[PDB]
Design an enzyme around this catalytic site. Structure first.
Site, PDB file in Angstrom:
ATOM      1  N   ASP A  10       3.665  13.051   9.736  1.00 24.81           N
ATOM      2  CA  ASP A  10       3.863  11.745  10.345  1.00 24.81           C
ATOM      3  C   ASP A  10       2.509  11.116  10.627  1.00 24.81           C
ATOM      4  O   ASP A  10       1.635  11.761  11.223  1.00 24.81           O
ATOM      5  CB  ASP A  10       4.677  11.864  11.631  1.00 24.81           C
ATOM      6  CG  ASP A  10       6.069  12.336  11.389  1.00 24.81           C
ATOM      7  OD1 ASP A  10       6.761  11.766  10.523  1.00 24.81           O
ATOM      8  OD2 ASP A  10       6.468  13.282  12.067  1.00 24.81           O
ATOM      9  N   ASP A  37      -1.249   4.405  10.118  1.00 26.17           N
ATOM     10  CA  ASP A  37      -2.450   3.774   9.608  1.00 26.17           C
ATOM     11  C   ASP A  37      -2.688   2.457  10.326  1.00 26.17           C
ATOM     12  O   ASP A  37      -1.764   1.664  10.524  1.00 26.17           O
ATOM     13  CB  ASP A  37      -2.356   3.468   8.107  1.00 26.17           C
ATOM     14  CG  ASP A  37      -2.566   4.661   7.230  1.00 26.17           C
ATOM     15  OD1 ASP A  37      -2.840   5.777   7.719  1.00 26.17           O
ATOM     16  OD2 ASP A  37      -2.461   4.438   5.999  1.00 26.17           O
ATOM     17  N   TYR A  81       0.827  -1.198   0.000  1.00 26.14           N
ATOM     18  CA  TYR A  81       0.000   0.000   0.000  1.00 26.14           C
ATOM     19  C   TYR A  81       0.865   1.254   0.000  1.00 26.14           C
ATOM     20  O   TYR A  81       0.614   2.191  -0.759  1.00 26.14           O
ATOM     21  CB  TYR A  81      -0.938  -0.022   1.215  1.00 26.14           C
ATOM     22  CG  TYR A  81      -1.662   1.262   1.437  1.00 26.14           C
ATOM     23  CD1 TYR A  81      -2.859   1.523   0.794  1.00 26.14           C
ATOM     24  CD2 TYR A  81      -1.155   2.228   2.299  1.00 26.14           C
ATOM     25  CE1 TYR A  81      -3.519   2.708   0.985  1.00 26.14           C
ATOM     26  CE2 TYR A  81      -1.813   3.420   2.503  1.00 26.14           C
ATOM     27  CZ  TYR A  81      -2.994   3.654   1.860  1.00 26.14           C
ATOM     28  OH  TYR A  81      -3.635   4.851   2.063  1.00 26.14           O
ATOM     29  N   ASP A 141      -9.878   9.121   7.640  1.00 28.77           N
ATOM     30  CA  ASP A 141      -8.591   9.767   7.393  1.00 28.77           C
ATOM     31  C   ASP A 141      -8.825  11.269   7.294  1.00 28.77           C
ATOM     32  O   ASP A 141      -9.291  11.773   6.248  1.00 28.77           O
ATOM     33  CB  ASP A 141      -7.959   9.216   6.118  1.00 28.77           C
ATOM     34  CG  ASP A 141      -6.555   9.721   5.894  1.00 28.77           C
ATOM     35  OD1 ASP A 141      -6.219  10.773   6.463  1.00 28.77           O
ATOM     36  OD2 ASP A 141      -5.798   9.079   5.110  1.00 28.77           O
TER      37      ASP A 141
END
Ligand SMILES: [Cl-]
Ligand SMILES: [Cl-]
Ligand SMILES: [Mg+2]
Lengths: 126, 128
Positions: free
Chosen positions: A98, A101, A14, A38
């Site tokens: 920074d 996930d 990914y 997100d």
């Protein structure tokens, strides 16, 4: 579900796709009913068209780069978490963000949920 | 305090690592809400409430010889949550080991940890 070792490979893949900017390949990694949060704290995005639009907005311009800053942490129940840094532009200036996930995968090895932890405290202007 | 801001989350989660590093079990347990849940490693059954959480930390840290440090910045949200990468160093089977972990935490409206999820498995263990 994908094994811990497989989760590490999928999550690394990914990031490689984000780094080269292949939006179509990214969207194909997601399950049909997947959700994206997100940044985490904002309402989930769902639907392939909507997820594609999200990645177009973020990556379409080119000039986004991304790299892992440490190993992928993987569970035995198809989930993992990874730290990485995004290089992008903000206010016309180069910056770095920074991010961590967290991903859950389904039985087909597709992303079922993604949650991205970051806020302005994780932004650096260069 | 109230529901932590992103900055406050960064400070709380950093203090947690310091407490693990020094091994102050009772100070760790105080940081948790009275009815908190811990999933460590994520995928195993949750641990409920301060008594069980204290037992869990005393098993993990009571033997001493554990050192922990952040390996990058704490990532924080605006809804009282954060995630951090760190490394735990321990001694096992006569071998110095290292375990790479990410903890995700949700805080309550009093600044206490409501839920903690720890992401790691044997793929994140290195022996010597
Ligand atoms: Cl790391
Ligand atoms: Cl990092
Ligand atoms: Mg309460």
């Amino acid at each position: 579900l994908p094994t811990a070792q497989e989760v590490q490979g999928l999550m690394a893949r990914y990031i490689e796709l984000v780094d080269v900017g292949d939006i179509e390949a990214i969207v194909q990694m997601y399950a049909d009913d997947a959700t994206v949060e997100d940044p985490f704290g904002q309402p989930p995005i769902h639907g392939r068209e909507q997820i594609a639009a999200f990645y177009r907005q973020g990556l379409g311009g080119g000039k986004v780069r991304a790299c892992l800053t440490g190993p992928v942490r993987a569970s035995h129940n198809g989930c993992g978490a990874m730290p990485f840094r995004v290089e992008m532009v903000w206010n016309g200036q180069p910056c770095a963000l920074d991010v961590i996930d967290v991903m859950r995968f389904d039985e087909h090895g597709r992303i079922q949920t993604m949650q991205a932890y970051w806020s302005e405290v994780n932004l650096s202007v260069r």
